Write a protein that holds these residues in place. Structure first.
Motif, PDB file in Angstrom:
ATOM      1  N   UNK A 177       0.828  -1.188   0.168  1.00  0.00           N
ATOM      2  CA  UNK A 177      -0.005  -0.061   0.183  1.00  0.00           C
ATOM      3  C   UNK A 177       1.006   1.432   0.123  1.00  0.00           C
ATOM      4  N   UNK A 178       1.636   1.370  -1.038  1.00  0.00           N
ATOM      5  CA  UNK A 178       2.355   2.512  -1.314  1.00  0.00           C
ATOM      6  C   UNK A 178       3.323   2.395  -2.464  1.00  0.00           C
ATOM      7  N   UNK A 179       3.870   3.789  -2.877  1.00  0.00           N
ATOM      8  CA  UNK A 179       4.774   3.601  -3.989  1.00  0.00           C
ATOM      9  C   UNK A 179       5.910   2.827  -3.807  1.00  0.00           C
ATOM     10  N   UNK A 180       6.470   2.604  -5.071  1.00  0.00           N
ATOM     11  CA  UNK A 180       7.822   1.851  -5.187  1.00  0.00           C
ATOM     12  C   UNK A 180       8.984   2.868  -5.249  1.00  0.00           C
ATOM     13  N   UNK A 181       9.974   2.827  -4.063  1.00  0.00           N
ATOM     14  CA  UNK A 181      10.877   3.918  -3.967  1.00  0.00           C
ATOM     15  C   UNK A 181      10.743   5.260  -4.412  1.00  0.00           C
ATOM     16  N   UNK A 182       9.693   5.736  -3.733  1.00  0.00           N
ATOM     17  CA  UNK A 182       9.277   7.103  -3.969  1.00  0.00           C
ATOM     18  C   UNK A 182      10.102   8.026  -3.115  1.00  0.00           C
ATOM     19  N   UNK A 183      10.183   9.496  -3.564  1.00  0.00           N
ATOM     20  CA  UNK A 183      11.152  10.424  -2.976  1.00  0.00           C
ATOM     21  C   UNK A 183      10.663  11.507  -2.921  1.00  0.00           C
ATOM     22  N   UNK A 184      10.395  12.440  -1.887  1.00  0.00           N
ATOM     23  CA  UNK A 184       9.927  13.831  -1.916  1.00  0.00           C
ATOM     24  C   UNK A 184      10.792  14.644  -0.875  1.00  0.00           C
ATOM     25  N   UNK A 185      11.063  15.973  -1.291  1.00  0.00           N
ATOM     26  CA  UNK A 185      11.484  16.833  -0.237  1.00  0.00           C
ATOM     27  C   UNK A 185      10.630  17.594   0.717  1.00  0.00           C
ATOM     28  N   UNK A 186       9.514  18.187   0.099  1.00  0.00           N
ATOM     29  CA  UNK A 186       8.123  18.815   0.849  1.00  0.00           C
ATOM     30  C   UNK A 186       6.901  18.419   0.530  1.00  0.00           C
ATOM     31  N   UNK A 187       6.596  17.823  -0.678  1.00  0.00           N
ATOM     32  CA  UNK A 187       5.436  17.600  -1.010  1.00  0.00           C
ATOM     33  C   UNK A 187       4.707  16.296  -0.316  1.00  0.00           C
ATOM     34  N   UNK A 188       3.492  16.289  -0.545  1.00  0.00           N
ATOM     35  CA  UNK A 188       2.406  15.253   0.105  1.00  0.00           C
ATOM     36  C   UNK A 188       2.095  14.089  -0.664  1.00  0.00           C
ATOM     37  N   UNK A 189       2.326  12.883  -0.235  1.00  0.00           N
ATOM     38  CA  UNK A 189       2.022  11.668  -1.123  1.00  0.00           C
ATOM     39  C   UNK A 189       0.802  11.247  -0.489  1.00  0.00           C
ATOM     40  N   UNK A 190      -0.417  11.610  -0.893  1.00  0.00           N
ATOM     41  CA  UNK A 190      -1.784  11.412  -0.322  1.00  0.00           C
ATOM     42  C   UNK A 190      -2.526  10.479  -1.594  1.00  0.00           C
ATOM     43  N   UNK A 191      -1.802   9.628  -2.216  1.00  0.00           N
ATOM     44  CA  UNK A 191      -2.612   8.660  -3.163  1.00  0.00           C
ATOM     45  C   UNK A 191      -3.202   7.505  -2.326  1.00  0.00           C
ATOM     46  N   UNK A 228      11.372   1.282   0.361  1.00  0.00           N
ATOM     47  CA  UNK A 228      12.528   2.013   0.500  1.00  0.00           C
ATOM     48  C   UNK A 228      12.377   3.581   0.258  1.00  0.00           C
ATOM     49  N   UNK A 229      11.247   4.146   1.047  1.00  0.00           N
ATOM     50  CA  UNK A 229      11.048   5.603   0.805  1.00  0.00           C
ATOM     51  C   UNK A 229      11.988   6.587   1.632  1.00  0.00           C
ATOM     52  N   UNK A 230      12.123   7.796   0.969  1.00  0.00           N
ATOM     53  CA  UNK A 230      12.962   8.562   1.764  1.00  0.00           C
ATOM     54  C   UNK A 230      12.221  10.163   1.387  1.00  0.00           C
ATOM     55  N   UNK A 231      12.263  10.975   2.817  1.00  0.00           N
ATOM     56  CA  UNK A 231      11.592  12.085   2.445  1.00  0.00           C
ATOM     57  C   UNK A 231      12.487  13.020   3.591  1.00  0.00           C
ATOM     58  N   UNK A 232      12.727  14.498   2.977  1.00  0.00           N
ATOM     59  CA  UNK A 232      13.670  15.024   4.005  1.00  0.00           C
ATOM     60  C   UNK A 232      12.526  15.916   4.977  1.00  0.00           C
ATOM     61  N   UNK A 233      11.353  16.635   4.421  1.00  0.00           N
ATOM     62  CA  UNK A 233      10.482  17.318   5.232  1.00  0.00           C
ATOM     63  C   UNK A 233       9.046  16.856   4.783  1.00  0.00           C
ATOM     64  N   UNK A 234       8.755  16.283   3.688  1.00  0.00           N
ATOM     65  CA  UNK A 234       7.387  16.126   3.376  1.00  0.00           C
ATOM     66  C   UNK A 234       6.760  15.025   4.226  1.00  0.00           C
ATOM     67  N   UNK A 235       5.529  14.819   3.982  1.00  0.00           N
ATOM     68  CA  UNK A 235       4.469  14.011   4.692  1.00  0.00           C
ATOM     69  C   UNK A 235       4.103  12.676   3.692  1.00  0.00           C
ATOM     70  N   UNK A 236       4.253  11.530   4.299  1.00  0.00           N
ATOM     71  CA  UNK A 236       3.746  10.163   3.605  1.00  0.00           C
ATOM     72  C   UNK A 236       2.275  10.111   4.023  1.00  0.00           C
ATOM     73  N   UNK A 237       1.353  10.446   3.597  1.00  0.00           N
ATOM     74  CA  UNK A 237      -0.044  10.159   4.092  1.00  0.00           C
ATOM     75  C   UNK A 237      -0.880   9.534   2.984  1.00  0.00           C
ATOM     76  N   UNK A 238      -0.289   8.331   2.424  1.00  0.00           N
ATOM     77  CA  UNK A 238      -0.792   7.458   1.362  1.00  0.00           C
ATOM     78  C   UNK A 238      -1.329   6.306   2.044  1.00  0.00           C
TER      79      UNK A 238
END
Lengths: 24, 24, 24, 24, 24, 25, 25, 25, 25, 25, 36, 36, 36, 36, 36
Positions: K22-36, L26-36
Motif C-alpha cells: 500500500x504505497x509507491x515503489x522507491x518514492x522520494x519527496x522533499x516537501x510534497x505530500x503523498x496522498x495517493x 525504501x522511501x525517503x523524505x526530508x520534510x514532506x508527509x507520507x499520508x498514502x
C-alpha cells in the motif's frame, strides 16, 4: 447529518439508511 | 451529527443507521 | 443530509436509502 | 439531500433509492 | 436532491430510483 | 482439483497475493 | 481441473495478484 | 480444463493480474 | 478446453491483465 | 477449443488485455 | 540544484519485484505530500 | 544540493521482494508527509 | 536547476516488475501533491 | 532551467514492466497535482 | 527555459511495456493538473 468518508478502504461500504429489511 | 472517517481500514464498513432488521 | 465520499475504495458501494427489502 | 461521490472506486455503485424490492 | 458523481469508476452504475421490482 | 463457495458472504479484504516462483535475476 | 461458485455474494476486494514465473533479467 | 459460475453475484474488484513468464531483458 | 457462465451477474471489475511471455529487449 | 456464455449478464469492466509475445526491439 | 530547495534521484542496474503493498515503489519527496 | 534543503538517493544492483506491507518500499523524505 | 526550486531525475539501464501496488512506480516530487 | 522553478527528467536505455498499479509509471512533478 | 517557469523532458533509446495501470506513462508536469 450523516457523513461517510472512506480513504483507501478495502471491502464494500454499507451506508444504507432507513431501508426496510436489507438482506445481503 | 454522525461522522464516519476510515483511513486505510481493512474490512467492510457498516455505518447503516435507522434501518429495519439488517441481516448480513 | 446524507453524504457519501469514497476515495479509491475496493469493493462495491451500497448507499441505497429508503428502498423496500433490498436483496443482493 | 443525497450525495454520491465516488473517486476511482473498483466495483459497481448502488445509489438506488425508494425502489421497490431490488433483486440483483 | 439525488446527485450521482462517478469519476473513473470500474463497473456498472445503478442510480435507478422509484422503479418497480428491478431484476438484473 | 476443484473448489467453490455456495452461499458465503465475504465482507472484507482477502490478501492471498500468491505468486509463482520466478528465479528473477 | 474445474472450479465454480453457485450462489456466492462477494462484497469486497480479492487480491490474488497471481503471476507466472518469468526469470526476468 | 473447464470452469464456470452458475448464479454468483460478485459486488467488487477481483485482481488476479495474471501474467505469463516472459524472460524480459 | 472450454469455459462458460450460465446465469452469473458480475457487478464490478475483473482485472486478469493476462499477457503472453514476450522476451522483449 | 470452444467457449461460450448462455444467459450471463456482465454489468462491468473485464480487462484481460491479452497480448501475444512479440520480442520487440 | 543549489541555493534553492531541490529533490533528485539517480538509479541504474535496478530491479524491483514486491508483493502487494500500500504505497509507491522507491518514492522520494522533499516537501510534497503523498496522498495517493 | 548545497546551501538549501535537499533530499537525494542513489541505488544500483538492487532487488527487493517483500510480502504484504502497509508502506512504501525504501522511501525517503526530508520534510514532506507520507499520508498514502 | 539553480537559484529556484526544482526537481529532476535521471535513470538508465532500468527494469521494474512489481505486483499490484497502490501507488506510482518510482515517483518523485519536490512540492506537488500526489492525489491519484 | 535557472532563476525560475522548473522540472525536468532524462532517461535512456529504459524498460518497465509492472503489474496492475494505481498510479503513473515513473511520474515526476515539481508543484502540480496528480489527480488522475 | 530560463527566467520563467518551464518544463522539459528528453528521451532516447526508450522502451516501455507496462500492464494495465491507471495513469499516464512517464508523464511530467511543472504546475498543471492531471485530471484524466
Amino acid at each position: 447529518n450523516f457523513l461517510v468518508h472512506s480513504s483507501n478502504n478495502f471491502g464494500a461500504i454499507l451506508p444504507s439508511t432507513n431501508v426496510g429489511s436489507n438482506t445481503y
